[PDB]
Chains A and B, each alone.
With several copies, the nearest count.
Chain A
Amino acid sequence: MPLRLDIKRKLTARSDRVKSVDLHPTEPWMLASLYNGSVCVWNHETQTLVKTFEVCDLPVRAAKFVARKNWVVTGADDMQIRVFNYNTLERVHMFEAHSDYIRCIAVHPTQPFILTSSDDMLIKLWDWDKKWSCSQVFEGHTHYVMQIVINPKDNNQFASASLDRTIKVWQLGSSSPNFTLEGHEKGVNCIDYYSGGDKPYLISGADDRLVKIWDYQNKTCVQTLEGHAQNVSCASFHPELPIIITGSEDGTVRIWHSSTYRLESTLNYGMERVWCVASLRGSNNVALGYDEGSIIVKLGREEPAMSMDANGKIIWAKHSEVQQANLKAMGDTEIKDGERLPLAVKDMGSCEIYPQTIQHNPNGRFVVVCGDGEYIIYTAMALRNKSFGSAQEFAWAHDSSEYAIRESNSIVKIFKNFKEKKSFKPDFGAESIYGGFLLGVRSVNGLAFYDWENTELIRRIEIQPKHIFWSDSGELVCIATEESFFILKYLSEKVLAAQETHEGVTEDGIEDAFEVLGEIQEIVKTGLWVGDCFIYTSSVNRLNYYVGGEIVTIAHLDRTMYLLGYIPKDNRLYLGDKELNIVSYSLLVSVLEYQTAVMRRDFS
C-alpha cells in the first residue's frame, strides 16, 4: 500500500556520529550527545539552538531532561554526573556514580528516580531527592551494562540488554532480575517497550538481522522475523502506526509494517547507521543519530475521518488506528457551554482501508471516504458500501449527485453514476481539482474556472490557493490560500449573454464573470461557511467570524481545533477536538442573518 503519506523531512543537521538523543517533551526540545564530545540542545522548529554544553570533550554517552524536576541531567564519561538545572543551564551538582563508561539512564517519572546502567557491569540506582544517593545497586551482570530501559509502564519493573546476549527483567525485590532469558545469538544491544499498556512487546536490537518479539505475560518469543538487507543497527516500534522501523549498520531504513510486516519501504539518508533513536511519545515525530548528521521527520494527519449529520451525529470512524468500527453518536442530553458531554456506544463498520478523508454527501448522507488511495463510499446507515474505485483527486458534484475524479495520471475523468462526463473534458495542467458549484481546476499557479457541463474558462485569478469552501448556495465563496484569504461574487448573466454571443477571453478566463469583493489577510485553523458568512477559525486560536466588516472572536480556544458542527436549530456549535470531547457554544444564526439582511436593507 502507498506512501500517499506523511513523511516530512522535518529538520535536518549534517554532523557527526551523534550517538545519543534524548527528548525534552515539555517544550519539544531535543538533547543530543555526540561522538565529538560536545552535546547540544536545539529547538528544531526554527533550527535554533536552545543551549549547547561542553560537558566533557570525550564522547558523551548519556542524556536525560528531567522535566518534572525542571532540570536536565547529563553524564559524560569522565564517569561523572554533572547536573544542570536547565532553567538557565545553571549547573547544579556533580558527583561520580558509576566509575566506568556510563551507557544509559532510565528514569522513574512517577517516582523521583534516575536509574543508570554502566559498563562497569553495574546498574546503580541513585535517588535525587536523597540528593543523588546510590540508593540501590542492581547487579547480576556478565558484561558491561550497555543499556537500561525502564518499563515505564511498570516504571517499577524494568528490563536490561547486554551483548553477552541476555536480558534480565527485574523486580525491585530482585536487585538482580527476576530472571534472565537468553535472547540474542549476537548480543542484545537494546531493549525497548511496547507503547500500549494493553499488550506487551519488546523489541531488542541486533545486527544479526533477526527480530524477536516477546510477550512478557506468557513470557514467550512471540516470533522471530527475517527478511533483512543489512545488519540492523536498529529497528523500532512505530508508536503511531503499526509499523516497524528498521534501521541498519549502514543506516538503511526499511519499514515493515507492524501489521503487514511487509516491507512497506526503504529510505536512504545514508547518513549512516542508526546510532540513536528517540521518539515523540505523542507518537509522531522521531529523531535518530546517524553519522553524516541526523534527520528528524514529521509523520502525521490531523484528524480522523468523520462527517456529521446535522441530526447530531458525527460519525467518525476509527479513533486513531482503531478499526473504523465505531461510528455513531446521536446523543441524548444537554449541558453548559464550558462544561463537557456524553456519547452513545454502537459501532458499525470494521473496514480495512485506512483513510484520511471523509466527506459527506451533500445532505450528509453518502460519504465518500478514500483510503489506501481508493474510494469507498458508503451507504452509511446502510453500512453498505455505497461504492469504490482508486483515486488520485476529487470533487463531489456539490449538488449531491455527481462526483469527479483525477486519475492517478492527471487528465480528468468524471463520473456521474459511473458514467464518465466528457462534456467538460479539458484535461489541462492542474494542481488540484475543485468542485463545488463552479468548477475549479487549479493549474499553473492559477486557479481556472470551469463550467459544469462543458468547461469554460470562466476566470483565472492571479495565483493558486490551498483550499476552497463555498458558501452555501455557493454564492460567496471562500478560498483559503495561506496567509491571505479572499471573498468573491460570481455574476451569471454576463456569462449567459457572453456565451450567447461567443467571442471571449479564457486565457484569463473571461473578465466578465466574477468580481473581487474584498480580502482578509488570513490564517485559518479551520473555517466555516455559515451560508455565505465566513465563520472561521484562525490558527491563532480565536474563533472568529467575519461579519459586517468585522471579524469578531466569539471565543478563543485553548489552542485552535476542529469545528464540531453547529447544528443550527440548536444554534450551537459543537466544537471538536480530536480526542472526543465535544464542547458547544450556542449562537443563534438569526442574529447573523438579522445583521446580514438589515445591511442589505432588510431592516424590517
Chain B
Amino acid sequence: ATRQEIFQEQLAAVPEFQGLGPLFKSSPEPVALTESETEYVIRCTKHTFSDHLVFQFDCTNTLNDQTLENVTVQMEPTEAYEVLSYVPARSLPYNQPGTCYTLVALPTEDPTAVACTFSCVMKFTVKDCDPNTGEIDEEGYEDEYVLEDLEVTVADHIQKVMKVNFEAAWDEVGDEFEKEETFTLSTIKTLEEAVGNIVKFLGMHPCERSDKVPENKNTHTLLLAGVFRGGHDILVRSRLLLLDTVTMQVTARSSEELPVDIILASVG
C-alpha cells in the first residue's frame, strides 16, 4: 500500500472500475507514450495493486491544431493479464493533462501472467480549434494514430526487501520454489553485462553481504530481494561463478509461481 497506494486512491475517484485493489508498487519508469513533443504528447505512468494494474495516462494533447475527443486507449497483451477495459479521456485540449486509463486484473499463480507488453493505438475524433474563441460542435472526424507500447515490469509491482528469515527463507524458497537456468560463458568472462540486466531489471537488493565488487572482483553472488504483487514474493539467488569462464547458477525461488519463470526472463 505504497506511495503508489496513494495513487490507488487517486485513481479511486473514478467509478468505472472493474477491479483495483490497493497499490503494491508503481512503475519503475514512466514512459512517454508519445515521443518528444509530438502532435500529441504522452507520458504515461503504470501502477500495480495486489489485484489490478492501472495505466493512467498523463498528458498534453499537444497541437493547438487539435483537441482530441472520443478518446479511449487500446492495449492489446502478450504475457498475461485479464483485460477488463480501455479508457477514454472524454476530451483533451491543448497543453493539458487529462486522464485516460487503461485497466487489467493481474493473474498471479500462473507461469507467465503479469509482465506484458500491450499495443497501443490512440483513437479519437479529431477536432480543429480556433484558440481565440473556438467552437465545440458534435461533428469532427476520427483518425487514429498508433501509440506506443506499454511493457509491464518486475518493479512496478515489487517492494525490494531484506528477508524475514533469510536463512531459512532462503532455503525454503528453494524448497517449494525453484527454477533454474545455467549458461556457460566462453567469449567474455564478465558478470557486468549480466549485471546491467539484473540489479536494474529486478530492482532488488543484491546481497546477504553479497553485493559489492570494486572496479574488479574475483567472484560474485547476489542473493537478492523483494516481494511481488498479489502478496507473494519473488526470490533470486544468483551465484555467478568464475572459474575463469563464467558458468553460473541463477536461481529464482519464489513465494509466487509466476515469478520464478519471470525472474529468469525479466532480469533480461
Q: Which residues of A contact B (CB under 8 A)?
A: 309, 311, 330, 332, 363, 381-382
Among A309, A330, A332, A382, the residue within 8 A (CB) of B39 is A382
| Least CB separation from B126: chain A residue | A330
Of A311, A332, A363, A382, which contacts B143 at CB under 8 A? A311
Can you add 11 more A-B contacts, CB < 8 Å, to A311-B143, A330-B141? Answer: A309-B143, A311-B144, A330-B143, A332-B141, A363-B146, A381-B39, A381-B63, A381-B65, A382-B38, A382-B39, A382-B63
Residues on A with beta carbons closer than 8 Å to the beta carbon of B146:
363
Write 13 A-B pairs (CB below 8 A) sorted by A numbering: A309-B143, A311-B143, A311-B144, A330-B141, A330-B143, A332-B141, A363-B146, A381-B39, A381-B63, A381-B65, A382-B38, A382-B39, A382-B63
* Chain B neighbourhood of A309, CB < 8 A: 143
What string of 1s and 0s marks CB contacts (under 8 Å) between B22-51 and chain A?
Answer: 000000000000000011000000000000
Closest to B142 in A: A311
User: Which residue in chain A gives the minimum CB-CB distance to B128?
Assistant: A346
10 closest cross-chain pairs (CB), A and B: A381-B39, A311-B143, A382-B39, A330-B141, A332-B141, A381-B63, A330-B143, A381-B65, A363-B146, A382-B63
- Which chain B residues (88-130) contact chain A, with CB distance < 8 Å? none
User: B53-84: contact bitstring with A at CB < 8 Å (1 yes, 0 no)?
Assistant: 00000000001010000000000000000000
Residues of B within 8 A of A (CB): 38-39, 63, 65, 141, 143-144, 146
Q: Which residues of A have CB within 8 Å of B65?
A: 381
Nearest neighbor of B66 in chain A, beta-carbon distance: A381
**What distance in Å separates the Cβ of B127 from its nearest Cβ neighbour in chain A?**
12
Residues on A with beta carbons closer than 8 Å to the beta carbon of B144:
311
Closest to A348 in B: B65
Contacts of B143 in A (CB 8 A): 309, 311, 330
Chain A CB within 10 A, most for which of B38, B39, B63, B144: B39
List residues of chain A with CB within 8 A of the CB of B39. 381-382
**A310: nearest residue on chain B (CB-CB)?**
B143
In angstroms, how far is the closest chain B Cβ from the Cβ of A349? 14
Chain B residues near A381 (CB, 8 Å)? 39, 63, 65
Give B40's nearest chain A residue, CB to CB: A381
Interface centre among A309, A330, A381, A382 (most CB of B within 10 A): A381
Which residues of chain B are within 8 angstroms of A363 by Cβ–Cβ distance? Answer: 146
B63 contacts across to A, CB distance below 8 A = 381-382
A309 closest partner in B (C-beta): B143
The closest CB in chain B to the CB of A311 belongs to: B143
Closest to A380 in B: B39
User: Taking the nearest CB of chain B, how far is it from the CB of A327, in angstroms?
Assistant: 13
A381's closest neighbor in chain B, by CB?
A: B39
Shortest CB-to-CB span from A380 to chain B, Å, is 9
| B70 smallest CB distance to A (angstroms) | 15
User: Shortest Cβ distance from B41 into chain A, in angstroms?
Assistant: 11
Name the A residues within 8 Å of B38 (CB-CB). Answer: 382
Tell me the nearest residue of chain A to B146, going by C-beta. A363
Q: Which residue of A lies closest to B39 (CB)?
A: A381
Nearest CB in chain B: distance from A218 CB, A: 37
Contacts of A311 in B (CB 8 A): 143-144
List residues of chain A with CB within 8 A of the CB of B141. 330, 332
Residues in B whose Cβ lies below 8 Å from that of A330 = 141, 143
Query: Which residue of A is nearest B38, CB measured?
Result: A382
Nearest CB of chain B from residue A211's CB, rounded to whole Å: 45
Complex: chain B residue closest to A384, CB-CB: B37
Closest-by-CB residue of B relative to A363 is B146
Residue among B63, B143, B144 with max Cβ neighbours from chain A (10 Å): B143
Please give me the residue from chain B that is nearest to A382 by CB atom. Answer: B39
Give B143 Cβ to nearest chain A Cβ, in Å. 4
B139 to chain A, nearest CB (A): 9
Residue of A nearest to B144 (CB): A311
Cβ of A602 to closest chain B Cβ, rounded Å: 24
Minimum C-beta distance from A144 to chain B (A)? 64
Most buried by B among A309, A311, A332: A311
Nearest B residue to A313, CB-CB: B143
**Closest residue on chain B to residue A312 by CB atoms:** B143
Residues from chain B with Cβ under 8 Å of A332 in the complex: 141
Residue of A nearest to B62 (CB): A382
Nearest B residue to A332 by beta-carbon distance?
B141
Q: Distance in Å from the Cβ of A366 to the closest Cβ of chain B?
A: 12
State the Cβ distance, A462 to closest chain B Cβ, in Å: 40
A382 shortest CB reach to chain B, Å: 6
Taking the closest CB of chain A, its distance from the CB of B69, in whole angstroms, is 15
What's the least CB distance linking A378 to chain B, in Å? 12
Closest CB of chain A to B66's CB: distance in Å?
A: 9
Q: Smallest CB–CB gap between A315 and chain B, Å? A: 13
Task: State how many angstroms separate the Cβ of A28 from the closest Cβ of chain B.
Answer: 44
Closest Cβ of chain A: how far from B140's Cβ, in Å?
11
Minimal beta-carbon separation of A347 from chain B (angstroms): 13
Which residue on chain B has the smallest CB distance to residue A383? Answer: B65
